[PDB]
Amino acid sequence: YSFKCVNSLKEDHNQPLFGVQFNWHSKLVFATVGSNRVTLYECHSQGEIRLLQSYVDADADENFYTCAWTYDSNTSHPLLAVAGSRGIIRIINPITMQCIKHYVGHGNAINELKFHPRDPNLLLSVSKDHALRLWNIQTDTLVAIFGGVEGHRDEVLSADYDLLGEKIMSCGMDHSLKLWRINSKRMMNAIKESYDYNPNKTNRPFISQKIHFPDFSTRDIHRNYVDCVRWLGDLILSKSCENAIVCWKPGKMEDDIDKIKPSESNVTILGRFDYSQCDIWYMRFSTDFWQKMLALGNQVGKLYVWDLEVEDPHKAKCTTLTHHKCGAAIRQTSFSRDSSILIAVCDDASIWRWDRL
């Protein structure tokens, strides 16, 4: 893999850009999130990054941390979910940048958003208040709260759906990774009820599931805050601030993920990808659409890209990408849907565009 840096820019607010996401759900357009805004850009030839339009929150004290794309099931158009410090989810029409609707949990910071891989209405949020929440954005219902008796004991920083959206792995400041299965009879039934719920046709409130018990948990992977997690098939990729992505699985080497029980005491390490100078927290890796490649920025503007197309996780091939003018911490990266462009965004509000050759 070989990429050439073709352009860069800086947003006027001079605050960190915490998040970036290409739109894969219909569109080449990407969103950046930082300060109290979200900004859309469109990629063109000769490295042009064309500024479109922003959403700016009415609260000058809001700080957006993340965003996530989906489809509107009512209008067929792409939609953008944004959230951050105020713990309010904004659903933004990316055409007009109008805020169409919002969701409030208990109102504590939201660290991550993810949409279900098969159902564009099912939005997962992870919070500074120790809980995950699953929302149905067609019927505007809180489907479930994941938290409580054996949930996270400190801020949740990240989470990810598996390929099918049957299960979620979450991770946090408590150093733990926790599995929550959503293909239980209980959860499939609760999703089905969320779709049957119309507040205009009934007297009841929608009753949320309180899921107090994860289906697997470990603290044996990292020795500090776990700030980013991803499924790679049935394996997990996760990181802390100890300059490593660990590739691992619940149970022993030969255990199937779907036969893992909540009492499982074992994990298996399949590999570890080391790098340098990335010991501040909330530094997120990303993969391309096909999960052939894995990209992470460090705190001094260096990019690491791993080629995952090898027989075993430990055989991954690393390429590094540097620019003499790119020296601020890279918080997140995103690949275009066709894998031809890589964007990195930075603590100094700078955006970096890398085109594949």
Ligand SMILES: CC[N+](C)(C)CCCS(=O)(=O)[O-]
């Ligand atoms: C703004 C994102 N949160 C979750 C607060 C992480 C801040 C980590 S920091 O202080 O290195 O920017």
